[PDB]
Write a protein that binds this DNA or RNA. Structure first.
Ligand SMILES: [Ca+2]
Ligand SMILES: [Ca+2]
Length: 293
DNA sequence: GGGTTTCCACTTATTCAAGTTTTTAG
DNA sequence: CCTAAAAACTTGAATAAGTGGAAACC
């Protein structure tokens, strides 16, 4: 049974809402619809999706390609569990807007309005602002569509449990070995990073004040830009980052990465990272986590 | 029924995580 | 001199988001 707030944090990172508007000759109005919430992780973290399934008691798990496994909740009556959960523990990223559109589509389908032409039209208005919006085909079939085009979400971190769930999806624990002019010739630097699209810049900046450390770094690969929350000072890592995730446990394979990460921190704290024997020990831990776990 | 729901195999763009190297700080 | 901290990126795939086909409920 996973924590309810750890779940929303994880959903804020890996979850997504789906609204299908498909042409269907067998449908009276000519369009079939599907509404649901899904998560797609690497096969290594299939354990998470099975704990979420037991926690919610809804959804179906199926392989998504050769290296991924998904958990999709399309059973309409099951969506009441999704809605019930996200009302008590709401999302805080821009995905909350997707959820809000998700509820609107839900009410339209609950009243069976999606089986008449009017309901389909309102679904096209809802889907126009959801995720990547309307497809070229949909946009051509409904050229006279309009709507509010969604409002911007601006919330901040609720509690630590949400952070543990969000870090379990977007966090990264790195042991950076730097070719240094030190006696050993190798500096051991611990780095904790959270990466998120620039759409949630305000939430990313709040990490510094919320955690009392770190800095924001923007990057970009041509037309795409993202933000990274970085913590490299050991005192902040050993006194701020580590304690938070010890009391607020992570989930998935990243908990194993975080555990080896703390092992290296124990060596640094004892200053054994400056001994040739200690440096060799940290080099072995890095290989055990770069490959897996 | 057969219109509508539900589920499973599968595809695709990019937002992520993971990684290395060089420079400045103290 | 020397160790820590930050800078400044690069990389490719685990994501998010989506599509195709169809069994089978109610
Ligand atoms: Ca995400
Ligand atoms: Ca992840």
């Amino acid at each position: 049974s996973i924590n309810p707030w750890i779940l929303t944090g994880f959903a804020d990172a890996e979850g997504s809402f789906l609204l299908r508007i498909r042409n269907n000759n067998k449908s009276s109005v000519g369009y079939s619809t599907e509404l649901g919430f899904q998560i797609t992780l690497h096969n290594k973290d299939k354990s998470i999706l099975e704990n979420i399934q037991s926690t919610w008691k809804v959804g179906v798990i199926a392989n998504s390609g050769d290296n991924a496994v998904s958990l999709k909740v399309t059973r309409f009556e099951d969506l009441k569990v999704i809605i019930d959960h996200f009302e008590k523990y709401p999302l805080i990223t821009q995905k909350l807007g997707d959820y809000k559109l998700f509820k609107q589509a839900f009410s339209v389908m609950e009243n069976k309005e999606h089986l008449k032409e009017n309901g389909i039209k309102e679904l096209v208005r809802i889907k126009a602002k959801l995720n990547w919006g309307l497809t070229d085909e949909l946009k051509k079939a409904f050229p006279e569509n309009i709507s509010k085009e969604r409002s911007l979400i601006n919330k901040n971190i609720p509690n630590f449990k949400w952070l543990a769930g969000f870090t379990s999806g977007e966090g990264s624990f790195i042991v950076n070995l730097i070719k240094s002019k030190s006696k050993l010739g190798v500096q051991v630097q611990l780095r904790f990073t959270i990466t998120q699209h620039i759409k949630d810049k305000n939430l990313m900046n709040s990490l510094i004040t919320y955690l009392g450390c770190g800095y924001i770094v923007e990057s970009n690969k041509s037309e795409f830009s993202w933000l990274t929350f970085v913590v490299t000072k050991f005192s902040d890592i050993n006194d701020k980052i580590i304690p938070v995730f010890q009391e607020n446990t992570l989930i998935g394979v990243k908990l194993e990465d975080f555990e080896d990460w703390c092992k290296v921190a124990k060596l640094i704290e004892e200053k054994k990272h400056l001994t040739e024997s200690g440096l060799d020990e940290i080099k072995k831990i890095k290989l055990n986590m770069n490959k897996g776990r």
